[PDB]
């Protein structure tokens, strides 16, 4: 649908780190976000272009537990369209969510994941994570960083899956407030 397509065009970029291929969401200005396990370095390949990462901060919850979200500042020639207003104030569930994926290997894809329900605790590959949500869809490898959306709202970042189920880190507006 319209919102999704626009989001892909204006905000979602194919990326590559030493950990592999990832989908990346640009939020505003030169601020972007990745799944923590992508482990961005001093630099990253964005659309086949070697870009400098200026800042990299990993998000943890009130008790210091991993949220699986890394916020990076980019050395870039342009600014991302500002979508903070499409991100809810509170981590929000959803009904018929589209998972937007875009890596060099899985380009410009819209995956129908169904209902997104509140999960919470998640053992992601041996690393404890909080503030996760879940969808019943056979999610596969290479989809991490994928953007979960529904009716104009950007609500989560795909971080992993167990074969029958997919999991995303929830998105709150507060994660992205100015600098």
């Amino acid at each position: 649908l319209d919102f999704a397509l626009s989001l892909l065009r204006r905000n979602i970029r194919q990326v590559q780190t030493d950990q592999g291929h990832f989908t990346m969401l640009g939020v505003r200005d030169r601020l972007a976000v990745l799944p923590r396990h992508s482990q961005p370095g001093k630099t990253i390949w964005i659309e086949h272009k070697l870009v400098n990462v200026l800042d990299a901060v990993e998000l943890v919850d009130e008790q210091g537990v991993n949220l699986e979200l890394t916020l990076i500042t980019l050395d870039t020639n342009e600014k991302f369209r500002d979508i903070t207003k499409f991100i809810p104030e509170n981590i929000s569930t959803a009904s018929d969510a589209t998972l937007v994926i875009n890596t060099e290997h899985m380009p410009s894809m819209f995956v129908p994941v169904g209902d997104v329900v509140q999960y919470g605790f998640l053992n992601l590959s041996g690393k404890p994570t909080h503030r996760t949500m879940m969808y019943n869809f056979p999610t596969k490898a290479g989809q991490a960083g994928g953007v979960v959306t529904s009716v104009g709202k950007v609500i989560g970042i795909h971080i992993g899956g167990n074969g029958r189920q997919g999991f995303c880190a929830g998105l709150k507006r507060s994660y992205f407030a100015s600098e």
């Binding site: 800042d55 901060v57 990993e58 943890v60 009130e62 949220l67 979200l69 507060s174 994660y175």
Partner: peptide, 7 residues
């Protein structure tokens, strides 16, 4: 080591 932030 990573720079952290409580959110």
């Amino acid at each position: 080591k990573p720079v952290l932030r409580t959110a």
